[PDB]
Design a protein that fits this description.
The chain has one helix spanning 2-10. The chain is mostly helical. The longest helix has 9 residues, at 2-10. The chain is elongated. It is classed as de novo protein. Keywords: synthetic construct, DE novo protein.
């Protein structure tokens, strides 16, 4: 989930 969320912001 940490990554899911990170990628959300990245994108």
């Amino acid at each position: 989930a940490a990554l899911a969320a990170a990628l959300a912001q990245a994108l």
